[PDB]
């Protein structure tokens, strides 16, 4: 209930369908066309329309609103633009796949070099998996080096000899055995030509190759129009109090747009083919290093400082990448960390929590008729006294900050509101020590609020945590809901974890001086007098009040 109301029904994701983006789709989902390299209009605010920071792409500022959806910075997701390229270029990630498809089909009449008449081809057709189907078809048709004008009755073949295609850098060379020996010519296979050849491939041949007519079409691996990400993807940073530095992606897009304008102007005005080749290779290099700057066998694109450019690919890989670093694991709220100490006078499932940590952390409790008096007492106490509270949440979701409220003593609570009270005794919390090698490294304890700045543990739980009190630190996580509290108290609680499934034996025992003392005290020649016996019997919480003979 932290989001403003929307009449769209709320559903969950059941399927993710992958595929390539078509140029028609890129143009259709775009809201503006990007054609001006200059970021700023006149260095007097109000960024230029049609530039890389167009206000229709979205708002990343507090006081400004998006001109496309009208929402604020918190709610606007950002909108895409497009950038028409003067000449088509290869997508750096699909170049070997383009090469294999070029091998699979005929460069003149866009048809597979073999038909279903060959039984091996029929068997290659039969496998449902597109990857394996493509692999089999490629393993067959790679050998075939000549289009067949007639059936091996005309299959539509043009009869031309299929060239040998070899990759060098991002440039494909097609060596034709032109008509024992002769002079063969190797001519550059420009992206436009391969795009035109792919465009004539029939849907059924496309299906035979493992591509899909609806989602993954072979000519969509050639970039003819580039989608422009919104500013939320590439935010600017404030280097100092005055100057603000642009993101790497914004600079790379500026380079791409300058190269595009260069190619267009060069083609329009006057065309020496060598200069066209140079500038178009520069454009191809910019588009390739915008997506992948770790290309083997060529120098990286560098910044003016000499550091390499941070490409989109490098944002998604590694420990600090998007997946590992922000989706499979992330930083979370409602957590605490401090040094741990031992406490012989704590229960096995209890944890001692400093008062400052209990004041900082909170749990949102719903106001009912069973707890309204206690909750309003907490609200009267305020955010600086324990037991107190920090916020009152209305049904509509408006928070009342009790720090800056001059009439907190005149706040009346209604049923259904939420009070973010301080951490209290017997609240279940999750406790954790890194590295978490097994599931007994995270267990649910009960809170006891105590003085001094350490966490306190019973000494029998130091074995599953593999912890000692010579400087170790441990983390604490506070559940924020009734269901989550029930899950912690009924599944992860310390007593339920005494016996481990790894070796069907307990993981917690009597240790250290309790073990030494229990050995010393149970020796045959240990005798105790009546007064000490009375003290030890009274020390037992479960003692029934009957002194043994």
């Amino acid at each position: 209930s932290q989001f403003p109301y929307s009449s769209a029904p709320l559903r969950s994701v059941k399927e993710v369908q992958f595929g390539l983006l078509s140029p028609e789709e890129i143009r259709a989902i775009s809201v503006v066309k990007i054609e001006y390299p200059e970021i700023m209009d006149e260095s007097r605010q109000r960024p230029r329309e049609g530039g890389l920071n167009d206000p229709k792409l979205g708002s990343i500022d507090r006081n400004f609103k998006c001109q496309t959806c009208g929402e604020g910075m918190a709610e606007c997701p950002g909108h895409f633009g497009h950038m028409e390229l003067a000449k088509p270029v290869f997508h750096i990630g699909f170049i070997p796949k383009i090469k294999k498809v070029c091998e699979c089909i005929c460069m003149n009449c866009g048809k597979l070099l073999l038909d279903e008449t060959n039984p091996t081809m029929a068997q290659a057709i039969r496998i449902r998996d597109p990857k394996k189907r493509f692999n089999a078809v490629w393993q067959l048709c790679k050998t075939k080096m000549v289009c067949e004008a007639d059936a091996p009755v005309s299959r539509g073949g043009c009869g031309n000899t299929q060239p040998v295609v070899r990759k060098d850098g991002m440039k494909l060379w097609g060596t034709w055995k032109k008509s024992r020996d002769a002079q063969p010519e190797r001519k550059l296979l420009t992206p436009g030509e391969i795009l035109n050849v792919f465009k004539h491939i029939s849907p059924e041949d496309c299906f035979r190759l493992g591509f899909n007519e609806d989602y993954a079409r072979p000519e969509w691996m050639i970039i003819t129009v580039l989608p422009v990400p919104p500013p939320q993807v590439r935010p600017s940073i404030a280097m100092d109090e005055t100057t603000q530095g642009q993101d790497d992606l914004t600079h790379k897009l500026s380079d791409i747009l300058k190269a595009n304008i260069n190619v267009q102007k060069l083609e329009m005005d006057g065309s020496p083919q060598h200069i066209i080749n140079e500038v178009e290779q520069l454009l191809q290099f910019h588009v390739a290093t915008y997506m992948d700057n770790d290309i083997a066998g060529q120098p990286q694109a560098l910044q003016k400082s000499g550091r390499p450019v941070k490409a989109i690919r490098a944002r998604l890989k590694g420990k600090e990448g998007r997946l590992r670093g922000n989706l499979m694991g992330k930083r979370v709220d409602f957590s605490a960390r401090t040094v741990i100490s031992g406490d012989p006078n704590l229960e096995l499932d209890q944890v001692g929590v400093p008062i400052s940590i209990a004041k900082t952390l909170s749990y949102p409790e719903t106001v009912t008729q069973y707890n309204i008096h206690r909750l309003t007492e907490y609200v009267r106490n305020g955010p600086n006294e324990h037991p107190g509270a920090k916020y009152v949440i209305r049904d509509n979701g408006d928070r009342i900050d009790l720090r800056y409220h001059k009439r907190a003593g005149d706040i009346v609570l209604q049923y259904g509101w939420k009070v973010e009270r301080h951490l209290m005794d017997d609240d279940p919390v999750l406790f954790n020590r890194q590295p978490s090698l097994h599931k007994m490294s995270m267990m649910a304890h009960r809170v006891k609020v105590m003085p001094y700045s350490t966490f306190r543990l019973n000494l029998s739980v130091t074995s599953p945590y593999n912890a000692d009190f010579d400087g170790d630190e441990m983390n604490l996580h506070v559940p924020q809901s009734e269901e989550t509290r029930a899950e912690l108290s009924q599944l992860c609680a310390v007593p339920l974890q005494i016996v481990s499934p790894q070796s069907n034996k307990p993981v917690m025992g009597i240790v250290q001086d309790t073990l030494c003392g229990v050995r010393k005290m149970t020796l045959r020649d240990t005798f105790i007098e009546y007064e000490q016996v009375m003290n030890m019997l009274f020390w037992v919480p479960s003692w029934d009040g009957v002194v043994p003979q």
Binding site: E483, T484, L491
Partner: protein, 84 residues
């Protein structure tokens, strides 16, 4: 289609620990959001304790839908599952 008739239910007749935890959490949340209680509470105030009391007396008005790997499901009432 996907539903399985009550006579040919083959899943375990006992409440598992995950089902018990989820049912207690959901019932506690509902009680804390002003849902009618089906048991007589003497002096209990905590929603989780009231939910546990409801579970012990087989008075929780919830149904567990257990999913099979093929897609079919069986519907079990909280009052007809044995709880330890």
């Amino acid at each position: 289609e996907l539903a399985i008739l009550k006579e040919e239910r083959t899943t375990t007749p006992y409440l598992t620990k995950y089902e018990r935890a989820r049912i207690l959490g959901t019932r506690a949340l509902q009680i804390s959001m002003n849902a009618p209680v089906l048991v007589d509470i003497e002096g209990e105030t905590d929603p989780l304790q009231i939910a546990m009391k409801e579970l012990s007396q087989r008075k929780i008005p919830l149904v567990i839908r257990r999913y099979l790997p093929d897609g079919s499901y069986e519907d079990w009432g909280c009052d007809e599952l044995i709880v330890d």
